[PDB]
Design an enzyme around this catalytic site. Structure first.
Site, short mmCIF file in Angstrom:
data_model
loop_
_atom_site.label_atom_id
_atom_site.label_comp_id
_atom_site.label_asym_id
_atom_site.label_seq_id
_atom_site.Cartn_x
_atom_site.Cartn_y
_atom_site.Cartn_z
N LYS A 67 0.80 -1.16 0.01
CA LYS A 67 -0.19 -0.07 0.10
C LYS A 67 1.00 1.08 0.05
CE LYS A 67 -2.38 1.61 3.72
NZ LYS A 67 -3.33 1.84 4.98
N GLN A 138 -11.39 8.67 9.56
CA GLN A 138 -11.08 7.48 10.51
C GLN A 138 -12.21 7.51 11.61
OE1 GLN A 138 -9.16 5.38 9.25
NE2 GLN A 138 -8.53 6.69 7.64
N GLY A 222 -4.35 8.25 15.62
CA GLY A 222 -3.90 9.33 14.85
C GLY A 222 -2.47 9.06 14.85
N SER A 296 -2.77 2.44 17.98
CA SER A 296 -2.72 1.78 16.65
C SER A 296 -2.06 2.93 15.74
CB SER A 296 -4.07 1.41 16.02
OG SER A 296 -4.03 1.59 14.60
N1 LIG Z 1 -4.17 2.28 11.11
C1 LIG Z 1 -3.85 3.61 11.49
O1 LIG Z 1 -3.42 4.04 12.66
C2 LIG Z 1 -4.15 5.01 10.64
C3 LIG Z 1 -3.54 6.31 11.21
N2 LIG Z 1 -4.33 7.68 10.61
C4 LIG Z 1 -4.31 8.88 11.42
O2 LIG Z 1 -5.80 9.08 11.85
C5 LIG Z 1 -5.98 10.60 12.33
C6 LIG Z 1 -7.50 10.62 11.42
O3 LIG Z 1 -7.14 10.43 10.18
P1 LIG Z 1 -8.16 11.24 9.15
O4 LIG Z 1 -9.75 10.78 9.89
O5 LIG Z 1 -8.30 10.47 7.88
O6 LIG Z 1 -7.81 12.61 8.67
P2 LIG Z 1 -9.05 13.73 8.55
O7 LIG Z 1 -8.22 15.19 8.28
O8 LIG Z 1 -10.13 13.68 7.54
O9 LIG Z 1 -9.70 13.87 10.01
C7 LIG Z 1 -8.93 14.46 11.19
C8 LIG Z 1 -9.89 15.13 12.44
O10 LIG Z 1 -9.51 15.37 13.34
C9 LIG Z 1 -9.75 16.72 13.78
N3 LIG Z 1 -8.74 17.52 14.56
C10 LIG Z 1 -7.67 17.76 14.41
N4 LIG Z 1 -6.92 18.48 15.18
C11 LIG Z 1 -8.04 18.48 16.45
C12 LIG Z 1 -7.82 18.89 17.71
N5 LIG Z 1 -7.02 19.55 18.33
N6 LIG Z 1 -8.86 19.07 18.40
C13 LIG Z 1 -9.88 18.25 17.94
N7 LIG Z 1 -10.05 17.76 16.89
C14 LIG Z 1 -9.24 17.83 16.00
C15 LIG Z 1 -9.79 17.53 12.53
O11 LIG Z 1 -10.76 18.74 12.57
C16 LIG Z 1 -10.55 16.59 11.59
O12 LIG Z 1 -11.71 16.41 11.83
C17 LIG Z 1 -4.74 11.01 11.53
O13 LIG Z 1 -3.94 11.32 12.32
C18 LIG Z 1 -4.07 9.77 10.71
O14 LIG Z 1 -2.71 10.11 10.41
C19 LIG Z 1 -5.03 7.56 9.43
C20 LIG Z 1 -5.27 6.10 8.77
C21 LIG Z 1 -5.04 4.82 9.47
O1 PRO Z 2 -1.04 3.11 8.23
C1 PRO Z 2 -1.82 4.07 7.44
O2 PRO Z 2 -2.69 3.59 6.68
C2 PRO Z 2 -2.09 5.51 8.02
C3 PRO Z 2 -1.92 6.14 6.93
C4 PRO Z 2 -1.59 7.73 7.56
C5 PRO Z 2 -0.60 7.38 8.64
N1 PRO Z 2 -0.86 5.90 8.91
#
Ligand SMILES: NC(=O)C1=CN([C@@H]2O[C@H](COP(=O)(O)OP(=O)(O)OC[C@H]3O[C@@H](n4cnc5c(N)ncnc54)[C@H](O)[C@@H]3O)[C@@H](O)[C@H]2O)C=CC1
Ligand code: PRO
Ligand SMILES: NC(=O)C1=CN([C@@H]2O[C@H](COP(=O)(O)OP(=O)(O)OC[C@H]3O[C@@H](n4cnc5c(N)ncnc54)[C@H](O)[C@@H]3O)[C@@H](O)[C@H]2O)C=CC1
Ligand code: PRO
Lengths: 325, 323
Positions: A67, A138, A222, A296
């Site tokens: 990926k 997420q 996150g 995670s």
């Molecule tokens: N298997 C895993 O652990 C993966 C890790 N991630 C991480 O999960 C997190 C979320 O990813 P997505 O939802 O796709 O991005 P996104 O940008 O679509 O959603 C992120 C949300 O966090 C909010 N936010 C940011 N800072 C904030 C704060 N101080 N207080 C309150 N709310 C806040 C934002 O307003 C936004 O709604 C990211 O950090 C991403 O890097 C993403 C995919 C999977």
């Molecule tokens: O493992 C993943 O897919 C997510 C993507 C952003 C950071 N980690």
């Protein structure tokens, strides 16, 4: 080669299936049947982004996939999602490429399901109220997978973006058939939670440990590098810590690296890897009073088991378009 | 995102283009403007093959690409190429995928070009005869790139499969417009060579150092793991060794790792990395009698500049399919 678009994938796979599949991938990983080298991260400092290369081979399932996923926290300002991914499936017998699939939807599905299996072992079975901090891409699959595993009744969502919280509460409430109310502080969502979902873009803690009462389970997904975290040091120290993978979390997650640099916790504070919990070798939630935290960051086996799941259903369903290269 | 097939790619890029571009990529790497972490190799022991993941970021060129390439030495028994690849281009500004393109043709072009750059700095300008050991896919672009940088007149080809050497001799002679003669031993091709090309699948040495006369320059690109080699220890010891990258060769090339285990050479026997030669920091060929050896295992930056050269020409030429 076969092509699978987001529209193609949404049709093929559901969260109950992905939960089962990600669970089997970790069982396959524990039995020594997985090759998961640490993922390669290239930081694009010039454009405020990351690109992640996550290959893995599951030899029993014969899933050989990579990926390519990227994280640009300012992408939402350009009308683009923060996380964009592509998944390539190769044939283990010849190395020939079998499929190119949209990875963005699978990334969200496999991430929610990974927390779904951990929630089964770590969360109180009588959990009914779930708190969500960060109402992004997420968080939707996070809450969905929690609902597949527990009898959730009501959800509380907090975001610094009032549009995202409102759209989440409305759309996810009809989605999951549960009541979802937006709250106006991270403190309130944390204090009232039986299960807490944190899926933020923030680089500094949003969840204070002083708010977490006993018996709550936390899923934190996150990640914005090794310098960033969404949980303060008190949250990590206070909890029974389970990680998706020790190699990944300890190398990538500031939520863990920073508290260990402070000296609040050490490497032994990690109770178990999820693969040990799935196998039954290490125990999950043992009593009502402990606070459980599943950290995670993502592991490549979840993409391979989901991509091969989706690919084989496309063949059986006649979904996707064939291309020459 | 845009889709690019071998038919789409084969027209777009030429060997003169790829040599200029690969040389520029190596200069960019020397100036600290490239992110090329060491590639991840997953060995599928179950099916006797390897799959290689090669990401890299060239920040000045703004080429952010990963190649998924595989080596299955038994694929030719199924009517399939030994090496199959795919290349994915991402947008540095958004992380979004820009293109998925076939990587087999690009890997052959960039591999030949990488040796093309090395030959320009390491081979005698009066080289006229080129010897080829292993007449497979890589050898063709290898000789083509040598022909673009030197005034080659005649080529000698040896292969363990006489069918492959004959087919090479026939097809390559019409393409390059030079006389190509089949020989019946690695010894003959090596003894008469001004430039020697080694591109085999062998897991044990095929070229003996005792055959190499002075003034010979060698391009060796074969790889079948760190336990395999196509050059004996004498060829390595006898030569001024230049590698495409120190991190890659010392971790992946049995042609180099094994002679270091024997004690015939140590880590200091590496004269220079190709990036230092391109930058002029290190000297190339200093005299006519030296034996120069370029050891190539493959580097992700060569894929990235070539993939972006081609992607950027496809847009300007209206080539490819959108999905
Ligand atoms: N298997 C895993 O652990 C993966 C890790 N991630 C991480 O999960 C997190 C979320 O990813 P997505 O939802 O796709 O991005 P996104 O940008 O679509 O959603 C992120 C949300 O966090 C909010 N936010 C940011 N800072 C904030 C704060 N101080 N207080 C309150 N709310 C806040 C934002 O307003 C936004 O709604 C990211 O950090 C991403 O890097 C993403 C995919 C999977
Ligand atoms: O493992 C993943 O897919 C997510 C993507 C952003 C950071 N980690
Ligand atoms: N340096 C780089 O960047 C790259 C390295 N390679 C490696 O180059 C080598 C060749 O690649 P391809 O030409 O694509 O494979 P190929 O299968 O098309 O050609 C290999 C040729 O080597 C011949 N050969 C095998 N064993 C021999 C022996 N003992 N003696 C003489 N000839 C022998 C074979 O008959 C065959 O004709 C492989 O090791 C490959 O892994 C592949 C792509 C680029
Ligand atoms: O660099 C490359 O692309 C080749 C593929 C097989 C081994 N090395």
């Amino acid at each position: 080669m076969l092509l699978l678009s987001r529209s193609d994938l949404e049709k093929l796979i559901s969260m109950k299936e992905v939960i089962e599949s990600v669970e089997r991938a970790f069982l396959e990983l524990y039995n020594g049947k997985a090759k998961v080298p640490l993922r390669t991260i290239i930081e694009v400092e010039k454009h405020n982004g990351f690109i992640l290369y996550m290959p893995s081979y599951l030899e029993d399932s014969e899933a050989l996939a990579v990926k390519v996923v990227s994280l640009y926290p300012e992408n939402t300002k350009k009308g683009l999602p923060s996380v964009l991914a592509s998944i390539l499936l190769n044939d283990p017998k010849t190395g020939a490429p079998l499929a190119l699939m949209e990875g963005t939807f699978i990334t969200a599905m496999r991430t929610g399901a990974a927390s779904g299996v951990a929630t089964k072992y770590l969360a109180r079975k009588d959990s009914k109220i779930a708190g969500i901090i960060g109402a992004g891409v997420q968080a939707r699959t996070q809450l969905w997978a929690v609902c597949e595993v527990r009898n959730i009744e009501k959800a509380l969502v907090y975001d610094i973006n009032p549009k995202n919280a409102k759209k989440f509460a409305e759309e996810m409430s009809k989605k999951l058939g549960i009541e979802i109310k937006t709250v106006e502080s991270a403190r309130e969502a944390t204090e009232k939670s039986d299960i807490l979902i944190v899926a933020t873009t923030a680089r500094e803690p949003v969840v204070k440990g002083g708010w977490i009462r006993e018996g709550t389970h936390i899923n934190s997904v996150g990640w914005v590098g090794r310098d960033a975290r969404e949980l303060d040091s008190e949250t990590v120290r206070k909890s029974k810590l389970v990680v998706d993978s020790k190699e990944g979390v300890l190398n990538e997650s500031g939520d863990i690296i920073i508290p260990m640099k402070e000296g609040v916790i050490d490497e032994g504070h990690i109770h178990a890897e999820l693969a040990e919990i799935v196998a039954g070798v290490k125990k999950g939630r043992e009593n009502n009073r402990e606070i459980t935290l599943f950290k995670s960051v993502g592991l490549a086996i979840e993409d391979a088991i989901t991509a091969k799941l989706a690919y084989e259903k496309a063949l059986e369903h006649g979904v996707g378009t064939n291309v020459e290269l």
